[PDB]
Each structure stands twice: as structure tokens, then as C-alpha cells.
Design goal:
This is DNA polymerase 1. This protein is an alpha+beta fold. The protein folds into 5 domains: 153 residues, DNA Polymerase, chain B, domain 1 (DNA Polymerase, Chain A, domain 1), CATH 3.30.342; 217 residues, Ribonuclease H-like superfamily/Ribonuclease H (Nucleotidyltransferase, domain 5, 2-Layer Sandwich); 159 residues, Alpha-Beta Complex (Palm domain of DNA polymerase), CATH 3.90.1600; 53 residues, B family DNA polymerase, finger domain (Helix Hairpins), CATH 1.10.287; 172 residues, no CATH class. It has 22 helices and 27 strands. Helix 9 crosses helix 15, helix 19 packs antiparallel against helix 20 and helix 20 packs antiparallel against helix 22. It is globular, with a radius of gyration of 29 Å. The chain binds magnesium ion (MG) (2 copies). The protein binds a DNA duplex (14 and 8 nucleotides) through strand 1, helix 3, strand 14, helix 6 and helix 21.
DNA sequence: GGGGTACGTGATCG
DNA sequence: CGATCACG
């Protein structure tokens, strides 16, 4: 026993075998388990029914499926004893084949734990936790550069560079002559791909770091390897990287290794308008990175001139991907360990799903039958359940306070749990203020009980940190207490998460109602100190001392948190999040701020996406800069009025009017024909190979009808013959981009034109 | 060699 | 309107 890095299962003679991938004293070891059996639970109307239920049959892969063994078990459901039947199956793929046949049965009240993947079922049931121990993993960052031309089919252009980096340095493999110390010149695209395969197998990294390798680098490598008739044996069992369908996007796994894609991780952890590698690197390390755009890479490759610049960019991409991976992996590894699921899965999950995985493991440990995920009907009804207005204008010297560390303590002290809510024949209860929900005090609730243990464990870690003289364990314990804080602070939100198993609307409302008493205290104490509260949400607040010096606002705020935390009982804690030079607030989670270092931080306002024209994105950036960098809302209004007049008078270049939208299906599969699909159908008719992945660039022209009938492919646009729709670019592009921002200053859509 | 098929928001279609 | 579709 060393350190579990992953778990999966393989089929042998039609039977499942669990594979546990381990790292033991620097050596890769694979353990096999043939004895663990898949199962579900069935709640029956009467014990007699089991004789009919155990005889239920299904079909899978032409062969019939049966219930292997049945076992009567006593468990806890909704904080009540319950008798259910454990229905054993031969193979985990038998469960989706037979579960609906069992649920359909007249004697079956309900079925449970029927959507838990087999490898996760194993980890939970066997009490196995990944990423435990001091085991030191090896890492390798990998990146690729491709030859791309406007609106090409995914994979048409060859891979022209492959870069990798580790502690030994950053290297580039290319198949054109470049005279640089870190460049390896091979003969072909085929030999460059074979070289990457060789590097990976020889370095044998435990972790492969990419920046959006799930959707770009690995699908592209696989497509080009296919075209070239070569295999990619990157798995430690010599298997090829496996593309998995996660939502509408992809996820790539490399067996026996951890494919650590930084893109989903950084997107969750930090707030940015764009997640370009350059923006991300500057945000984390405060250092600038140069970008070489796709068109520049194409020009250099095709001409053979300026290739040294392209190779430096490729090398830096790998080098910074390595630095970022080493920065963000320790926290992902501690979250994995805390929820008891592999890094690959954990790094690609929301906190709501991390809470559910923690709860599922703790439910097994406590013999608690887990509730089911809602059906489409129940999921929609939860979204429909309904259950303070910001200060207008531009504010200077804004202080940010965080409330989130208040709620776990409220859940624990008031025993807020779906299993304690409105229980019959309960002797003592807590009543939520205003909402009136009653929570039984007769037993500790499942969630309050888990939260208490989490918070106690964090206090123990913090105590070990103060009393430790070792900087190495202090670093590790710091990630551990941080991982707990992240998990504990996600419970409040989870009660209201419509896809949650332990979803509880009355729990969320009650926590909000009890929480409000502390928010009202903070608000009152701030206001008596001369502070003006500009924005308040359940998460925190923004305040300033109108007309005060910035150092004075800071000093008073820091002194205020120190004071309030000394008045608030237990682990109830207020946090000073930060300070901002300027800011404005539109509504709930719609605001924009600027720090003292000139970095603009926004929430729910920016439109930095390819399906918005450059004119709209450029105008919005200019409006935000006029307001936050120049403190000038009159400048911002003049910007909009000038841009809209320029659109009216056909003074805007057509290149700034292009909309880009991806084709995601065969064209016949579309139900609603949007502008990009109408344009795509016309291209296909012209002989163009239209395939999913293709990005359609179009311009909306002047005329009668919906925009779809008036959209033209950019390659077909002729400035002499065609006239763009100025009304569409004004009303549907530019004004929507700025109208929300300017509403915070008293302007309506009508006020932003001449 | 498997395996749960994000999520939240806004636009344009029908 | 609800339904469909795409962004990151
Ligand atoms: Mg897996
Ligand atoms: Mg790159």
C-alpha cells in the first residue's frame, strides 16, 4: 500500500475486474480485485414480494441479465430505520439494463443507489481514499501548435509543433528546420507524433498537464494519428488516450496516469473575462506572456520565415503550463483525498458534485440510504421554487467583506438538515425566523453532524500548524485546512442545488433567515462607524466611507473585522476579502470593480465570447475603461453614441461585424435554423464538407425577415454589393453589451443614441 | 476496456 | 411564450 492515483474496471470473460493504480516507493503498481459485486437497493411493499422481484430479467449484448443474489438489509432513510433489499448483479453494465424493469414492478416502492459508477462504488465501499501518503509524483506538461486557416474542419491542418516541459526544461519537436537549442527537428508530422509517444513512455510521468487538452491537444493528436495510421500508446497498459463525452464537450483520460487539464481547474478557481494562457499566467505569477496568433503561425510555417518566434511561443506554452500545473495540482490532490475520489474526476467537478461525493461516502460509513437524483419534472420544479438593491453610481475606495464562513456554523447550531425538518412527535425544535421551519433537536442531523466533524478537523490542523517547526508539513497542512474550508463553505449552496440528492429548499431558506440576523448586525455596526453599504448578497458586502482617504477606509475595515469576530460566538467568521479603487453595482452578482494595481474584476457583465461581434466587445471594453480607469460615465455614453452613429453611416469595417458560431451536429439534425446554420446549409450546397466542430463566420445584412435569412458567410461578403444591418448591430449587438452597465448610472437604451 | 451523459445565462427560432 | 442552441 502506497498511494492510489486512480481506479477503473476491465471485463474478463464477461466478468468485471477492478483495477487500482498505485504509486509505491516511486514504483507504478496495478492491483486487481475480481470479488467486488455490483448492486442496487429496492424498497418493497412487503417481504413476500422478493420471490417475484428476484425473478426479474433483462437483456444486454444479446444475452439475458439476472439478479445474482438478494440480501435483506437494515439501513437509515430520512433519519428513520428502513428495510431494503440489496440486489446483486454480475456486471455493472447489468444495472442500466435491469433497474427500470425492477422500478416498473408493482411490489417495488422505489429503487436506490442505481447511478453510482462501479469504480466509485468500489472506492466508497472498500473505504479507499486516493492521494494519501507522502508519495512524490512526476509531471510533464504537453502542448501542440497546428496549422489553421479560417473555418477549416477540425483536424484538416497538420500539427506543426509539439512542446513539452518538466523540471529538466522545455523542448519543441517540429518537422521544419529551426536553429534553436531547445528545438528537435524531425522529418515529418508522423515522426514528430511518434517522438512525443517516445518522450511520454521514456519519462513515464505520473501526471500529464495540458491547458485545454481535453478539447484541443488530445482530440487533435488522435485525429492526426488516425489520418497518419499510427497508434498513441500513452497509457501505462499501452492503451490510446480515451475521449469521454462530458456534457457537450470532451474529457480525455490516459490510463495509469493523471491527465490534469488546467482549463476546468483555473476556470473554477479564479475570476477572469478570458481564460487565455497569457491572461491566466499573468494573473497567478504577475508576469507577462507574449501571444502568437494562429494567422501569424500559418504565415511563418507556409513562408518558412519567422519560425524562431513561433518555436519560442510553443516552448513558453509548455514551460508556463508546467509552472501552472505545479501551482494548482496540490489543492486538487487534497480535495481528491478529502472527498475520496480520483484527481481526474475531482479536477473536472463542481463543488456541488464534490459535496455529493463526500456525502455518498459518509452515507455508506453511517449506513444511510442515499436519496435519488431528481427526475426531469422534479429538477424543473426545484428550478421554479422562488424562496438589498445596490447603490447607483461610481464609488471610490471600496472594501469587500465575505460572509460565507458564517453558514456552516448556522447549519450545525440549528441542526438544519432535511432529516430534522418538521418531524412528527418531536420534543424540542428550532424555529427559523420569518419562514417558520421547525428543525428537530432530538438527534443530530446527517449534514450538521458531518460539518461539525469537518470544522473540528480544520481546527486541529490549524493548531498543528502553529505548533509545527517543519516548513514542509506546514505547506501540506495549509492545503488540507484550505480544502476543508472549500468543502464546508459549499454546503449552504448545495441545499438549494436542484440536482442535489440531499436537496432541501426549507433548509436553504432557514439558513438564509438565521444568517440575515448576523448580516443585519454587520450592516448596523458598519453604518454606525460611518461606512455606507453599497452592495449586499448572501456571500458578502461592499462598503466605503464616503469621501475618506483609502488608507483610512482600509485601517477602519481591518479594525472592524477584528472587532466583529470578537463579538460573534464560536467559529462564525467575517473575512476581509479586499480593496478596490473604484466600482459600480448593477444588481445581484452584476458589478464591476478595479483594484489599486489597475486590474478590472467583473461579475455577470462582460461579453468576451466569439458569438458577439468585435464592435460590441470593443465598445463594451471602452465603456468599462472609461468608467473604471477614467472615472468618466459621460465619456462612456459619448463612446456608445459615436459607435452607433458610425454603424448608421456605414463607417465601421465589416471585419468588426463577424459573428462566430460552431456547428455541433449534422445539418439535418437541427430543429431551429439559426443564422450560422442557414449559412452552413448554403456552404454544404456549394460542395463544402460541413462537419461538427466547424466554426461559421457570418455578417447580418440589411433586409426583410428574421436574421437567419439575412446572414451571409464572411468569405461571400463583398463590401461593394452587400450592405450590413446597422439596426441589428446597434440594437442587438452594441446596445445590449452596454445597456446593463449604463443602467447603474441612470441611462435607458434610448439615452445611448443621438 | 466503461459510463455520472456539466451548468447557468441570453439570444433567436418557431 | 416555450424550445432550442451555443458560449466558456
Ligand atoms: Mg475514471
Ligand atoms: Mg498552445
Amino acid at each position: 500500500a502506497g498511494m492510489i492515483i486512480d481506479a477503473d474496471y476491465i471485463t474478463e470473460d464477461g466478468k468485471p475486474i477492478i483495477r487500482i493504480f498505485k504509486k509505491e516507493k516511486g514504483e507504478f503498481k496495478v492491483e486487481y480485485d475480481r470479488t467486488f459485486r455490483p448492486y442496487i437497493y429496492a424498497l418493497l411493499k412487503d417481504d413476500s414480494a422478493i420471490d417475484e422481484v428476484k425473478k426479474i430479467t433483462a437483456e444486454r449484448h444479446g444475452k439475458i441479465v439476472r439478479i445474482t443474489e438478494v440480501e435483506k438489509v437494515q439501513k437509515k432513510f430520512l433519519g428513520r430505520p428502513i428495510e431494503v433489499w440489496k440486489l446483486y448483479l454480475e456486471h455493472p453494465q447489468d444495472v442500466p439494463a435491469i433497474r427500470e424493469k425492477i422500478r416498473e414492478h408493482p411490489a417495488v416502492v422505489d429503487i436506490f443507489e442505481y447511478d453510482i459508477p462501479f469504480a466509485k462504488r468500489y472506492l466508497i465501499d472498500k473505504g479507499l481514499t486516493p492521494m494519501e501518503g507522502n508519495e512524490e509524483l512526476t509531471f510533464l506538461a504537453v502542448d501542440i501548435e497546428t496549422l489553421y486557416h479560417e473555418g477549416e474542419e477540425f483536424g484538416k491542418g497538420p500539427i506543426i509543433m509539439i512542446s513539452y516541459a518538466d523540471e529538466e526544461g522545455a523542448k519543441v519537436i517540429t518537422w521544419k528546420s529551426i536553429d534553436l537549442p531547445y528545438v528537435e527537428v524531425v522529418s515529418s508530422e508522423r515522426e514528430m507524433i511518434k517522438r512525443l509517444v517516445k518522450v511520454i513512455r521514456e519519462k513515464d510521468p505520473d501526471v500529464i498537464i495540458t491547458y485545454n487538452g481535453d478539447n484541443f491537444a488530445f482530440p487533435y493528436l488522435l485525429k492526426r494519428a488516425e489520418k497518419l495510421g499510427i497508434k498513441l500508446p500513452l497509457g501505462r497498459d499501452n492503451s490510446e488516450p480515451k475521449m469521454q463525452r462530458m456534457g457537450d464537450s470532451l474529457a480525455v483520460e490516459i490510463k495509469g496516469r493523471i491527465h490534469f487539464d488546467l482549463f476546468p481547474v483555473i476556470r473554477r478557481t479564479i475570476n477572469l473575462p478570458t481564460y487565455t494562457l497569457e491572461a491566466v499566467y499573468e494573473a497567478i505569477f504577475g508576469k507577462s506572456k507574449e501571444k502568437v496568433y494562429a494567422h501569424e503561425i500559418a504565415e511563418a510555417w507556409e513562408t518558412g520565415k519567422g519560425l524562431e518566434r513561433v518555436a519560442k511561443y510553443s516552448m513558453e506554452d509548455a514551460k508556463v503550463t508546467f509552472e501552472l500545473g505545479k501551482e494548482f495540482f496540490p489543492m486538487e490532490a487534497q480535495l481528491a483525498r478529502l472527498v475520496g475520489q480520483p484527481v481526474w474526476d475531482v479536477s473536472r467537478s463542481s463543488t456541488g458534485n464534490l459535496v455529493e461525493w463526500f456525502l455518498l461516502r459518509k452515507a455508506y460509513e453511517r449506513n444511510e440510504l442515499a436519496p435519488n437524483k431528481p427526475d426531469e419534472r422534479e429538477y424543473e420544479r426545484r428550478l421554479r421554487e422562488s424562496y438589498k438593491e445596490p447603490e447607483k453610481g461610481l464609488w471610490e475606495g471600496i472594501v469587500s467583506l465575505d460572509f460565507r464562513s458564517l453558514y456552516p456554523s448556522i447549519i450545525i447550531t440549528h441542526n438544519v438538515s432535511p432529516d430534522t425538518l418538521n418531524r412528527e412527535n418531536c420534543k424540542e425544535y428550532d424555529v427559523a425566523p420569518q419562514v417558520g421551519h421547525r428543525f428537530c433537536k432530538d438527534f443530530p442531523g446527517f449534514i450538521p453532524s458531518l460539518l461539525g466533524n469537518l470544522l473540528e478537523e480544520r481546527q486541529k490542523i490549524k493548531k498543528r500548524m502553529k505548533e509545527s517547526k517543519d516548513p514542509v508539513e506546514k505547506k501540506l497542512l495549509d492545503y488540507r485546512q484550505r480544502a476543508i474550508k472549500i468543502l464546508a463553505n459549499s454546503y449552504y449552496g448545495y441545499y438549494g442545488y436542484a440536482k442535489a440528492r440531499w436537496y432541501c429548499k426549507e433548509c436553504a431558506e432557514s439558513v438564509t433567515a438565521w444568517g440575515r440576523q448576523y448580516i443585519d448586525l454587520v450592516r448596523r455596526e458598519l453604518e454606525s462607524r460611518g461606512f455606507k453599504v453599497l452592495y449586499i448578497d448572501t456571500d458578502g458586502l461592499y462598503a466605503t466611507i464616503p469621501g475618506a482617504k483609502h488608507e483610512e477606509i482600509k485601517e477602519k475595515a481591518l479594525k472592524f473585522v477584528e472587532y466583529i469576530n470578537s463579538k460573534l460566538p464560536g467559529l462564525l467568521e467575517l473575512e476581509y476579502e479586499g480593496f478596490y479603487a473604484r466600482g459600480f453595482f448593477v444588481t445581484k452578482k452584476k458589478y464591476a470593480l478595479i483594484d489599486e494595481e489597475g486590474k478590472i474584476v467583473t461579475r455577470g457583465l462582460e461579453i468576451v465570447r466569439r458569438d458577439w461581434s468585435e464592435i460590441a466587445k470593443e465598445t463594451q471594453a471602452k465603456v468599462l475603461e472609461a468608467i473604471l480607469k477614467h472615472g468618466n460615465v459621460d465619456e462612456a455614453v459619448k463612446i456608445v453614441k459615436e459607435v452607433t452613429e458610425k454603424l448608421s453611416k456605414y463607417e465601421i469595417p465589416p471585419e468588426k461585424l463577424v459573428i462566430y458560431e460552431q456547428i455541433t451536429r449534422p445539418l439535418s439534425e437541427y430543429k431551429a435554423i439559426g443564422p450560422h446554420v442557414a449559412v452552413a446549409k448554403r456552404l454544404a450546397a456549394k460542395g463544402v464538407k460541413v462537419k461538427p466542430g466547424m466554426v461559421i463566420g457570418y455578417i447580418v445584412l440589411r433586409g426583410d425577415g428574421p436574421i437567419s435569412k439575412r446572414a451571409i458567410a464572411i468569405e461571400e461578403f463583398d463590401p461593394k454589393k452587400h450592405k450590413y444591418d446597422a439596426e441589428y448591430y446597434i440594437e442587438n449587438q452594441v446596445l445590449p453589451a452596454v445597456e446593463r452597465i449604463l443602467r447603474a448610472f441612470g441611462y435607458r437604451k434610448e439615452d445611448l443614441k443621438y
